Design a protein around this ligand. Structure first.
Ligand SMILES: [Mg+2]
Ligand SMILES: [Zn+2]
Ligand SMILES: [Zn+2]
Lengths: 69, 102, 1159
RNA sequence: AGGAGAGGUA
DNA sequence: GGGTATTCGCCGTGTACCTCTCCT
DNA sequence: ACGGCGAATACCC
């Protein structure tokens, strides 16, 4: 609860349950891309908060783009 | 104090042992399940019931995943429900799964 | 669909039991004496049940995986994995049939009902004490007639042969195997057409409900008598060794041996043509052995083992508090889990906990193995596992980076509601206790005199996100049972904030003029100005108001030094009028309320932390203590008590001349003492509250700064009676029965009680302590029942379109308001328009009432509105968001997927331990108990009359017969009053007697609305007397589960007045609206259940068998061959898949959008 | 490994 | 024949945790 | 031990 607020994301998503579903899809796609093991052990963040933050900034993803069918 | 990550399990039900003298494991009782239900935590409640206690095939895969940094989850059925349906048919009753085409 | 969709429960034919098995067990041999190898055809054989070691046969000829599907020839054993011993059964070929004890003694008996003979007569034929004529033959006899084995020779010189009769279980099996079900339906439906439903047209009704059940499924009735027995796999009744050459064997092997050793005995007795007088004694012994194997205690006495303790059967490993359902399927001890003692740790942020290094290193151990083997410290996991046990230096920083943004949940001992689990962010401490933020303690109900806590680790990203988004302690700001906050400062945060914001009249630095918070700070830190001195301060800040606009607060206000020192923590949006008062507990909760409603979530969790720090700091700097002179004893006490004594002496002076009997030694002396107790408790607050100064001719009373007074008036800790006993007088005490001990304790704890006064106060103390522990069972039972009746209620859609509800008003006592219409209509949406008395409307139907719309209800003189209740929702198997209303914990409208049932059940139950004198009343309400001698209502209208022959059956003459003829007659006892006078015109629902109010005589005579009104005001008048506050939308989502079955009136496809679940009546009465035209749809009447009957009458057998009465439920489910669509909350945890609520709904919904987008 | 009895904590 | 009026059996009675000895 | 519920049977309308 340092610098990612759940109130910041409840302006984009619904129900506080949709937030969990969408954030988990985003996080799973981040983690199934590498994101570690090579050079950034203590130089990055957790995919959970990285995915939860891109929703609170209208960043790399919005709810409609989060699919990647 | 007593923490535990993975120890050794029972024989009949295949859940963890309990009591800090063997290696313990805390009882996530039923009142503690009503609370996860009142939050709507479905993913937290599905793994505290299968991959953490007695999904025999799921424990090994969860441990092998964490140590290797992967993601995969099948929750086949808790091995203590196979124990119950196997002793309800040790009476004269037939409890079984089905596919509902009608 | 790739996995089962239902679970069905049948009856097992002998032909299908022999298909489960893999061989017959014949000898009661478990294991070899000296070597540890199974016998040949015993309870543990390896040709039957499977190999003992993985991928090798018993003798050792094929020990490999290279031989997958080989069966050996030296031994009949198979080369396969040894897990199959958990799954693979065999059987026992009985030579005598034996009944199944469940289908005989489960009350009712599905066997004494097929034949229509009382079980007292079936038990004689089944345990060899009488005969039955399987066939009377051409002989004149009857069929199901009991021939005494002596009277079996009735005319053996004239009856002889050419008819059949026997005894045992083959008698009953032959009576079942040849019994014409269609024909008994024929001549039984001809016996129920009579409509003579007095005494026989109820006992004949159940028999055909049973006989049509067998025609429907396919189960022959002769399968209730076993001709073959199955034996459990061996790895489920295990033979683990013991310390020192022993075996802690099971009781399922004892009871299997006690059956094989009578089967074999009776078999080779049959071979020899041994006499019948002993072969029958054997057969009766084979039957009781099987009845004990299935469950001992039903019929036998106590069939008992070595340690004089009765053996545990198969029907005990699935039932009761220690069976399989509870204790193993709603249970499950878990990994990645720990425990410790909790300490206070007051420098934490509300979202944090202190976690020892020693615990956190165990709990997070595979994460650490991976992060070692990742960042080039160990190559294979063995060296990493090795450096974790030596506790190197490179390990304690990896552990700090691994648990960084990885939350954990903490739980306390009884999880009474859902705030008993919250997620936190761990920070490694050193020590062995857990640090718990001071503000999350009233949620958990914890303090720090010994309590412990458990820590669980979420493992998956969908559970790590669920921990942050839903459970994390920063989201749980308000109660789900009310709207009130749960992070309100409590005890010595309240005392610091109360202390610095009081004010002293003539103080040092009084009247100064400051322009900032930096000014008052700098001037205070110099020791030159008081903290209670009145000052003037200049403010300039923005303040949001009710509508949402933002005006500007300016000027120069009159403050105190201490209040203005709090101005630094107030956020922008809140007015300084909040802090500019004395800050008792109530006002701090109001500050937090406003901060949440006007500013939101993180603003409130920052304001709370800052108030915590300020209170902790300024209670210290104050040096506030308690001595023995704070307990100031009034100066009138001795004279007050002496006058009470002289009055007591005069009362007994009266009594000695026989002028009064019970008053002159009771109810008068006790009133003298009860009045003096409170006069002295009044004098004691005029001494601990007031003060005195007279410096500049200043002789007057000022509010005291006494430390005992300031602790109570702060609302921090302490009452007026607790303070009355320390420095007033303790007054009257109670003997446990309840009466008052005539001699009052005229001493307080400060001067000290004597020994004859300290004795009489131990009765009450022991009575209280005894109540306290013999009551949590009463409340835990009620809570568990409520969670089983209301569990599967979930909000599943936004609107149902209904337009019906309930009339809400103020719940007056008949003397005064006691609760306003506002605070009762907040959060509830409107079902009808709210037109005013002049004619114009204010609010349309369908408006979610909130705080900005309920003033219109009170400012415009409205006093009865029609709110969309959940007793009246039109949704099937769920609720809608617009009939529920507000969330009560988010201060919004509910979301789709929000489990209102559990939330509703553990908000009536959690305060259970706080009300007992009470809890029996809410039990007798939620259980719909038809009370003793309740009343008698009025079924029909007309005029009133009467008539009786003094036969204690006073009839009714409600037939007015003035408009024609009428048939309106009743009966009653002759020793009771009929509330209707000798004449009246009483319509449906009038009372022709007086007494309690039956909740079933309100549901058919007055409809659903009077019943809802009754139970709703009744359940709340019991919680409000103890000051407990539950929203009445929680009692209404439980009454909805008491009205869910109806008694039929018409018929389209079902029987008559037989009950039925509404969601069944409603779906067919909607096919007929399509199928034929309206096809006389079906008309029905709602009836009322209890919370236990409603939960046992469920349409799920898996969910009712988990609850209680497991055998009474499983026998019926197997005879009716019921099917369980999983469909529910509890049904879905037994088989381990996502519950249909919360995130389990939303993943289905949000995935329905993908297959659409790929099309 | 499991169960009994007895005590104790919250 | 119908309708009570006892009479008798069945099912239920909070959560988590620690220690000891004794039996198998 | 206590309570509440339900099937069983005997004693009067
Ligand atoms: Mg405590
Ligand atoms: Zn072999
Ligand atoms: Zn509705």
């Amino acid at each position: 609860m340092a610098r990612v607020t759940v109130e910041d994301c409840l302006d984009k998503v619904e129900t506080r349950f949709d937030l969990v579903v969408l954030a988990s899809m985003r996080a799973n796609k981040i983690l199934k891309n590498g994101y570690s093991e090579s050079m950034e052990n203590e130089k990055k963040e957790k995919a959970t908060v990285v995915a939860l933050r891109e929703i609170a900034e209208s960043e790399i993803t919005s709810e409609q783009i989060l699919r990647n069918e | 104090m007593h923490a535990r990550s993975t120890g050794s399990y029972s024989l009949v039900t295949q859940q963890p042992l309990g009591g800090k003298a063997q290696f313990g494991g805390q009882r996530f009782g039923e009142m503690e399940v009503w609370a996860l239900q009142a939050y709507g935590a479905a993913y937290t409640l599905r793994e505290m019931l299968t991959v953490k206690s007695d999904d025999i095939a799921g424990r090994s895969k969860m441990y092998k995943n964490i140590v290797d940094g992967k993601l995969t989850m099948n929750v086949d059925v808790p091995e203590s429900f196979n124990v119950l349906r196997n002793e309800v048919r040790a009476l004269g009753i037939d409890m079984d799964f089905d596919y509902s085409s009608e | 669909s790739k996995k089962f969709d239902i679970i069905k429960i049948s009856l097992a034919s002998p032909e299908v039991i022999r298909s489960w098995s893999h061989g017959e067990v014949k000898k009661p041999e478990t294991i070899n004496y000296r070597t540890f190898k199974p016998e040949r055809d015993g309870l543990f054989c390896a040709k039957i049940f499977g190999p003992i070691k993985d991928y090798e046969c018993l003798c050792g000829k094929y020990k490999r995986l290279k031989h997958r599907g080989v069966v050996c020839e030296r031994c009949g054993v198979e080369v396969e994995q040894a897990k199959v011993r958990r799954e693979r059964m065999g059987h026992i070929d009985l030579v005598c049939p034996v009944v199944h004890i469940w289908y005989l003694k489960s009350l009712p008996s599905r066997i004494g009902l097929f034949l229509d003979m009382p079980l007292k007569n079936v038990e004689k034929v089944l345990y060899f004490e009488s005969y039955i004529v399987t066939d009377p033959g051409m002989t004149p006899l009857e069929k199901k007639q009991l021939l005494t084995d002596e009277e079996y020779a009735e005319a053996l010189e004239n009856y002889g042969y050419e008819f059949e009769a026997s005894m045992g279980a083959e008698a009953i099996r032959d009576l079942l195997a040849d019994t014409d079900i269609e024909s008994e339906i024929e001549l039984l439906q001809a016996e129920c057409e009579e409509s003579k439903s007095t005494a026989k047209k109820e006992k004949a009704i159940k028999r055909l409900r049973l006989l049509e059940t067998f025609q429907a499924s396919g189960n022959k009735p002769e399968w209730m008598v076993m001709t073959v027995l199955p034996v459990l796999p061996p790895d489920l009744r295990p033979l683990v060794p013991i310390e020192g050459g022993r075996f802690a064997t099971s009781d399922l092997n004892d009871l299997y041996r006690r059956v094989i050793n009578r089967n074999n005995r009776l078999k080779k007795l049959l071979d020899l043509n041994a006499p019948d007088i002993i072969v029958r004694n054997e057969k009766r012994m084979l039957q009781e052995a099987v009845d004990a194997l299935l469950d001992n205690g039903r019929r036998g006495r106590a069939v008992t083992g070595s340690n004089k303790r009765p053996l545990k059967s198969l029907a005990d490993m699935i039932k009761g508090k220690q069976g399989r359902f509870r204790q193993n399927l709603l249970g499950k001890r878990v990994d990645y889990s720990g425990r410790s003692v909790i300490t206070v740790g007051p420098s934490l942020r509300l979202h944090e906990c202190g976690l020892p290094k020693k615990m956190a290193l165990e709990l997070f151990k595979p994460f650490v193995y991976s992060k070692l083997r990742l960042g080039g410290h160990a190559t294979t996991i063995k060296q990493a596992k090795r450096m974790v046990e030596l506790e190197e230096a490179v390990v304690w920083d990896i552990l700090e980076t691994v648990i960084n943004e990885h939350p954990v949940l903490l739980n306390r001992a009884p999880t009474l509601h859902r705030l008993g689990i919250q997620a936190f962010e761990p920070r490694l401490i050193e020590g062995k206790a857990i640090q718990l933020h001071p503000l999350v303690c009233a949620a958990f109900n914890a303090d720090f005199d010994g309590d412990q806590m458990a820590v669980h680790v979420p493992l998956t990203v969908e559970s790590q996100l669920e921990a942050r988004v839903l459970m994390m302690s920063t989201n749980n700001i308000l109660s789900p049972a009310s709207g009130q906050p749960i992070i309100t400062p409590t005890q010595d945060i309240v005392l610091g904030l109360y202390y610095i914001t009081r004010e002293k009249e003539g103080a040092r630095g009084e009247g100064k003029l400051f322009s900032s918070y930096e000014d008052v700070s700098r001037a205070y830190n110099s020791g030159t100005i008081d903290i209670h001195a009145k000052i003037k301060l200049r403010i300039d800040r923005q303040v949001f108001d009710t509508k949402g606009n933002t005006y500007n607060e300016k000027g120069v206000v009159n403050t105190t030094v201490g209040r203005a020192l709090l101005l630094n923590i107030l956020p922008e949006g809140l007015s300084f009028s909040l802090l500019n008062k004395v800050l008792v507990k109530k006002e701090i909760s109001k500050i937090i309320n406003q901060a949440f409603r006007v500013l939101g979530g993180k603003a409130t969790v920052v304001l709370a932390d800052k108030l915590m720090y300020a209170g902790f700091k300024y209670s210290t700097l104050s040096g506030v203590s308690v001595g023995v002179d704070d307990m100031t004893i009034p100066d009138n006490k001795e004279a007050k008590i002496e006058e009470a004594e002289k009055e007591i002496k005069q009362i007994t002076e009266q009594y000695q001349s026989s002028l009064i009997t019970e008053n002159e030694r009771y109810n008068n002396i006790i009133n003298i003492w009860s009045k003096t107790s409170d006069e002295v408790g009044a004098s004691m607050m005029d001494a601990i509250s007031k003060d005195t100064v007279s410096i500049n001719g200043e002789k007057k009373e000022i509010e005291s700064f006494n430390s005992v007074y300031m602790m109570a008036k702060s609302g921090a800790r302490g009452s007026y009676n607790q303070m009355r006993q320390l420095a007033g007088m303790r007054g009257l005490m109670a003997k446990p029965d309840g009466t008052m001990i005539e001699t009052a304790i005229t001493a307080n704890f400060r001067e000290g009680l004597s020994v004859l006064q300290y004795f009489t106060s131990t009765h009450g103390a022991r009575k209280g302590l005894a109540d306290t522990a013999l009551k949590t069972a009463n409340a835990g039972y009620l809570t568990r029942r409520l969670v089983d009746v209301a569990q599967d209620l979930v909000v599943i859609e936004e609107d149902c379109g209904t337009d019906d509800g309930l009339m809400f008003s103020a719940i007056v006592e008949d003397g005064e308001v006691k609760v306003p219409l506002v605070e009762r209509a907040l959060g509830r949406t409107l079902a009808a328009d709210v037109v005013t008395e002049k004619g114009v409307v204010l609010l349309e139907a369908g408006t979610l009432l909130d705080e900005n719309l309920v003033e219109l209800l009170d400012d415009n003189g409205i006093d009865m509105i029609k709110v969309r209740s959940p007793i009246t929702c039109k949704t099937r198997r769920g609720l809608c968001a617009k009939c529920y209303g507000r969330d009560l914990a988010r201060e919004r409208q509910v979301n789709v997927g929000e489990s209102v049932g559990v939330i509703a059940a553990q908000s009536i139950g959690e305060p259970g331990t706080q009300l007992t004198m009470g809890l029996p009343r809410v039990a007798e309400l939620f259980e719909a108990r038809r009370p003793k001698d309740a009343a008698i209502l009025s079924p029909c209208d007309g005029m009133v009359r009467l008539g009786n022959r003094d036969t204690k059956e006073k009839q009714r003459i409600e037939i007015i017969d003035k408009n024609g003829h009428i048939v309106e007659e009743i009966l009653l006892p002759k020793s009771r009053h009929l509330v209707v006078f000798d004449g009246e015109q009483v319509s449906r629902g009038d009372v022709l007697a007086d007494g309690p109010t039956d909740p079933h005589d309100l549901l058919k005579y007055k409809g659903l609305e009077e019943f809802a009104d009754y139970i709703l005001i009744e359940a709340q008048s019991v919680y409000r007397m103890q000051g407990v506050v539950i929203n009445d939308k929680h009692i209404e989502t439980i009454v909805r589960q008491m009205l869910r079955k109806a008694v039929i009136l018409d018929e389209g496809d079902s029987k008559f007045v037989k009950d039925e679940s509404i969601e069944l009546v409603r779906i067919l009465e909607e096919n007929d609206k399509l199928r034929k035209q309206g096809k006389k749809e079906v008309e029905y009447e709602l009836v009322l259940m209890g919370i236990t009957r409603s939960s046992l009458s469920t349409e799920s057998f898996l969910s009712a068998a988990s609850f209680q009465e497991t055998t009474r439920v499983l026998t019926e489910a197997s005879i009716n061959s019921q099917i369980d669509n999983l469909r529910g909350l509890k049904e879905n945890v037994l088989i381990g898949r996502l519950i249909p609520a919360g995130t389990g709904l939303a993943v289905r919904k949000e995935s329905a959008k993908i297959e659409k987008m790929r099309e």
